[PDB]
Amino acid sequence: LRYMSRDDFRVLTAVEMGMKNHEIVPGSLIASIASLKHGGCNKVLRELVKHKLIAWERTKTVQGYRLTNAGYDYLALKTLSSRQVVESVGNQMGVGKESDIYIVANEEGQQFALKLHRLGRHNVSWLYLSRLSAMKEFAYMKALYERKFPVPKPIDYNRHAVVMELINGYPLCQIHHVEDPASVYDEAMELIVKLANHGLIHGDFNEFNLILDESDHITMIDFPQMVSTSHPNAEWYFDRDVKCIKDFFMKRFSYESELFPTFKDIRREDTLDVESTIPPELVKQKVKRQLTKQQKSAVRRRLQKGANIFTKQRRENMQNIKSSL
Amino acid sequence: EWMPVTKLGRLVKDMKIKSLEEIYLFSLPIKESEIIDFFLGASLKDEVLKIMPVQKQTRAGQRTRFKAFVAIGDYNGHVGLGVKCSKEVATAIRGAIILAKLSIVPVRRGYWGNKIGKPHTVPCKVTGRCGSVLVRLIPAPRGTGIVSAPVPKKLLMMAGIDDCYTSARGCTATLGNFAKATFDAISKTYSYLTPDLWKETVFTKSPYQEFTDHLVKT
RNA sequence: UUAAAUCCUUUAACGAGGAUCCAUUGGAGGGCAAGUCUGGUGCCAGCAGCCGCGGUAAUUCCAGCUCCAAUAGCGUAUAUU
RNA sequence: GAAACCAAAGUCUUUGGGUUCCGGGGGGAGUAUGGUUGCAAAGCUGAAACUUAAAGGAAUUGACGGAAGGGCACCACCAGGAGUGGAGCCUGCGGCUUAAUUUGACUCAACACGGGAAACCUCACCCGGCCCGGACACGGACAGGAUUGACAGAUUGAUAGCUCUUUCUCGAUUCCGUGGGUGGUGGUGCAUGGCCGUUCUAGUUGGUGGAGCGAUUUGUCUGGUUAAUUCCGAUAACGAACGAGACUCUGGCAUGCUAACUAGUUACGCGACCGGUCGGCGUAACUUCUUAGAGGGACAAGUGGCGUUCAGCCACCCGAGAUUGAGCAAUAACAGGUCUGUGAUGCCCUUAGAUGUCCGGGGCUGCACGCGCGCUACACUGACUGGCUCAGCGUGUCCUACGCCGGCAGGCGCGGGUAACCCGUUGAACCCCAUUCGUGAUGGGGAUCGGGGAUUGCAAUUAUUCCCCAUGAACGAGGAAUUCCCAGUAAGUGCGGGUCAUAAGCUUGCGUUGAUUAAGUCCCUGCCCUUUGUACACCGCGUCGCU
């Protein structure tokens, strides 16, 4: 849980700055880009290693710290807390392979769903691929909700976290019986034609990516696999998804289809496949920026002398040599 | 047990070469450690000047190996200096000692004032230049003692010089260069020509040329 | 003794067994002579001319013990060679 | 000469040919201020306060290249097979419960690892209950017994002489209270004495000589070649040691040899049966089969091609085998260490026993869920029913033959085997051959349940396991994703070992039926060489509010 709520923001963000450019970030660089408090950040790092926030690395010459899987997760929730979306944690968690579903509650008490991308090449690249995944998923989530589609409502995105509307139900793969099989079938078949009208093919439109809300309403999730209709095999991915649903309702619910939708309509809807002159106030700001940069460069060279590990190794052998002589 | 390899060595083994001076007269290379250990014997004491540990850059990583600076010296005659690097420290030391015995040089001893008694000081002010270290030895009056830094103090003591004014210039802190400079200075004592050695040098037969018939049998 | 004294010198008596008639100041990683001893502390307190020591086995801090240097002296700051 | 380099940058501690300018750790700073020159922009001259253990120059190895070339790997892909992931069940890890659900490891080396199949033990876990727990010093009791041992009966969850009736014996083997440090079937830490495991699997390391003030380099390499510091060979190197290699075994081959009363064949007698069949029985044939030994046998032997015409590489004939697999072989790094070794060893603990022994009952299986290895399936290339015929690795003083009683698990009687002898020609399953079923949740599939019976055992209730009836669920070839796989291999299919009283969907071996595709590549995923370069620089986080 989150108790510490001051210096932990600045130190962890400073790691993320170094993570985008380099692998393991040395402790010398951290304090320079987090200049608000000086000296006492080294004990904060020792509190960060207690939790699964940062990992230590002392291989051969490389001495420093790298951000963990769970440590990257805490940073997004800390940003979402300032945007007043997340306050307390709900416990109903569906631990998946590509993502983790966490229930979140706001100031109001209204429960929302949170998605956290867990892509698992070094861990630096793995925590960068999760960044691009959430930004792509939120892009489709906004694009479909605006265009009448039955998708969860997009709220906020932070690095890898995506806040969505809480639609609670069961996935189609674990459904025994539906009270009205025909009405549910026609609803699902319409949504494939709907996407094709907007110039989109789902690709993997199966029973594993569909959730029923009280056996009345079909909800769609997971959107990183979507392709354009400009693709040469556009009708192939269209027909494969149709046959997947055609066979499933005949298999599980024993419903044979009377309507066979195979229409190519591109595009009647929006193409979503793309988706003295200088005042003294300014003089003061400019002088300040110059004077801070001169101090920051000097502090970097003071911190680069921390090598402490090199001095410790040299001292051990000297004691052995003098005793043997 | 010693079994000599060189021709010089074989001569030494027997009784054909009487002193160590007959080797220095013909500037023959002493290639065996035993030759020195035969002539000077119990008289050669040793001082370990420094044991500096260095880490060798290897593809397997870093391992510790020790560099030993040993100055061997028979008093009132002969000095040598050796530098060895090895895994263990004792090994390094013995290696250095062996190496320092191969490097034994005679030092010429002079007089400061009037030449009364035994010689005690360096004959004339000599110098030893070794990689930015410049050691100067200067003739001192009898009983002054060696007025120097600790290392050339040692080296001069084990040379059998009783008294000498020293002066060093440059980076005297690097021990190898300092000791090697002082050794180089002290060697140069015989190389310096005085009015004492102006007489035409009458040539004795070389150890090889004299005992040629004895070397036929081996 | 001395102006008169005092001190020194000279001398009667009393005056020495270790809990005394009890020696101190700095230091003990390296420079630099002397502990990987024991307890305490846990990048805190602090030390450290400089190099550095301390973030739980501290040869560097506060103590104890032990040892070393100088010795009725020995540290510290400053001017200067 | 720090050196790269320099006939000057030489003739410098062996320091003095004349002479001008000029530097004294880095910054602040070539900034302020003054002066002066300048139309101006500016130039020349030119500080301090203060701040900092460094700022730098040469050279040298190459941790890392987001550098380049090669090479290799189904723990990589390609063409594919079997799949898992979907279903039920079983198990492991999370998580969840609970008095307890004992437990280290979490992308290989986390994941049926502790041989861990846990009714008891194992058991470390929980709820309970008896029992006593040192030496020492002080104060009390004992010969007018300190104390031990003790038949039967009554007690609590237990045949508790560790309580009462019994007090009957046993002769100091003492026990009753209080404590203070000097507690030892102690715990851990260090000095030292012996012995292990971990990563790849190809290097590692001296000695002497040479080069450099030295770090270092040469040896350890142009080229070809090799898995390779391998080899040919070139050469400021020459020689080594260590490991890989070599050594040894093993397997493939022998109608050559040595033998086999616990191996087998052939022939010959006798018998049984219809000139033949007989795992029926009895010694002349010696090794084909079986065994277990010796000796052979393959060495790049030969031919062809390619190759500095050498080292070697590729192809092919004959051959059992032309590229068998293991150990040895007794490396490098370990700061992982290991163990009843010694130190009047350093500390910490010892009615806070470093898990005190025992007693009874529980738990390890508990269950909405995730993540995973498996088993059975999803039928027609099948299921059922009858008939037929073939193993090998192995085991055994519980393995079991044989008769009888049993629908069935099983009982009862009697033998052999401490084992090429008996189980046992191991009588296997798949498969084959016929019979019935007929595309349906079907007789496929068997979960879950309901009654009996039988063992195993001190004990089966939370079903040990097996048997017989009845119920008969999900499951219609499984999405993203992912594992193993080059030939007697994958996959189907049974059997044996392993813990063991009964306990086996596990692990580990063995046979048996036996494939598709491939003989390529670096595309992905990685790993390994070689060559070459190398000791987070600069330009793009703020606003306001009172003391």
Curated annotation (Swiss-Prot), chain A:
Modification note: Autophosphorylated (in vitro).
Reactions that this protein is recorded to catalyse: L-seryl-[protein] + ATP = O-phospho-L-seryl-[protein] + ADP + H(+); L-threonyl-[protein] + ATP = O-phospho-L-threonyl-[protein] + ADP + H(+)
Species the sequence originates in: Homo sapiens
Protein's job: Serine/threonine-protein kinase involved in the final steps of cytoplasmic maturation of the 40S ribosomal subunit. Involved in export of the 40S pre-ribosome particles (pre-40S) from the nucleus to the cytoplasm. Its kinase activity is required for the release of NOB1, PNO1 and LTV1 from the late pre-40S and the processing of 18S-E pre-rRNA to the mature 18S rRNA. Regulates the timing of the metaphase-anaphase transition during mitotic progression, and its phosphorylation, most likely by PLK1, regulates this function.
Family under the similarity heading: Belongs to the protein kinase superfamily. RIO-type Ser/Thr kinase family.
Positions of the Protein kinase domain: 89-248
Complexes and interactors: Associated with late 40S pre-ribosomal particles. Interacts with PLK1 (via its N-terminus).
GO CC terms: cytoplasm; cytosol; nucleoplasm; nucleus; preribosome, small subunit precursor
Binding, ATP: 115
GO BP term, example: protein autophosphorylation
Effect of residue 222 to A: Abolishes autophosphorylation; impairs release of pre-40S trans-acting factors and rRNA processing
EC class (word): transferase
Gene that produces this protein: RIOK2
Compartments (UniProt record): Cytoplasm
UniProt GO molecular function: ATP binding; metal ion binding; protein kinase activity; protein serine kinase activity; protein serine/threonine kinase activity
InterPro entries for this protein: Kinase-like_dom_sf, Rio2, RIO2_wHTH_N, RIO_dom, RIO_kinase, RIO_kinase_CS, WH-like_DNA-bd_sf, WH_DNA-bd_sf
TM region positions: none
Leader sequence residues: none
EC number annotated for this UniProt entry: 2.7.11.1
Protein name: Serine/threonine-protein kinase RIO2
Any Pfam family: Rio2_N
Keyword terms, alphabetized: ATP-binding, Cell cycle, Cytoplasm, Kinase, Magnesium, Metal-binding, Nucleotide-binding, Phosphoprotein, Ribosome biogenesis, Serine/threonine-protein kinase, Transferase
Cofactors (names): Mg(2+)
Residues at the active site: 204 (proton acceptor)
Curated annotation (Swiss-Prot), chain B:
Record-level GO cellular component terms: cytoplasm; cytosol; cytosolic ribosome; cytosolic small ribosomal subunit; extracellular exosome; focal adhesion; membrane; nucleoplasm
Entire protein: shown range: 59 to 276 of 293
Positions of post-translational Phosphothreonine modification: 194, 212
Domain of life: Eukaryota
All residue ranges annotated as the S5 DRBM domain in the record: 44-107
UniProt modified residues of type Phosphoserine: 206
Organism: Homo sapiens
Cross-link (Glycyl lysine isopeptide (Lys-Gly) (interchain with G-Cter in SUMO1)), chain numbering: 217
Name this polypeptide is given: Small ribosomal subunit protein uS5
GO biological process: cytoplasmic translation; positive regulation of ubiquitin-protein transferase activity; translation
Subunit structure: Component of the small ribosomal subunit. Interacts with zinc finger protein ZNF277 (via zinc-finger domains); the interaction is direct; the interaction is extra-ribosomal. Interaction with ZNF277 competes with the binding of RPS2 to protein arginine methyltransferase PRMT3.
Recorded name of the encoding gene: RPS2
